[PDB]
């Protein structure tokens, strides 16, 4: 099986953030599976692989753009299809960065939930 941790970054400050500011760390470990696919889950997924999406603040409803970092995307092993559905795959026993996507974002002080789906892949 897979052992998954999604770890929020400490010390994030409201206001103008750096481009690609790190906001969470995804940790996936396994003794049995060599790879995994991952997709973001929200009310507005914005690309064909589900690796960028938008999330809403609990107290304000304001949206921010989030996703895998450019560096993390370049570490993908492949993009595979599960009954026609794209999933980008990555090595198990590794970590990936979730970031604020695109150009610098001005983020309103709030709590923003992030949800990911992870599935084992045997290449």
């Amino acid at each position: 099986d897979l052992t998954v941790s999604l770890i929020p970054v400490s010390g994030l400050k409201a206001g103008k953030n750096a481009p690609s500011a790190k906001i969470a760390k995804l940790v996936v470990n396994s003794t049995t599976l060599k790879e995994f696919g991952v997709r973001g889950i929200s009310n507005n997924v914005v690309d064909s692989t589900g690796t960028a999406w938008r999330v809403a603040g609990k107290n304000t409803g304001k949206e921010i753009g989030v996703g895998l970092s450019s560096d993390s995307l370049r570490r993908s092993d492949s993009t595979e299809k599960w009954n026609g559905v794209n999933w980008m795959t990555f090595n198990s026993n590794d970590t990936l960065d979730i970031v604020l996507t695109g150009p610098a974002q001005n983020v309103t002080a709030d709590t923003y939930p992030i949800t990911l789906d992870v599935v084992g892949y045997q290449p």
Binding site: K13, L33, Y112, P113, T115, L116, V119, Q122
Partner: peptide
Amino acid sequence: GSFLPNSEQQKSADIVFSS
């Protein structure tokens, strides 16, 4: 290759931006 449907999991976390 193949996906392992029994291994699929959803994981969530709260990201906090403070004033």
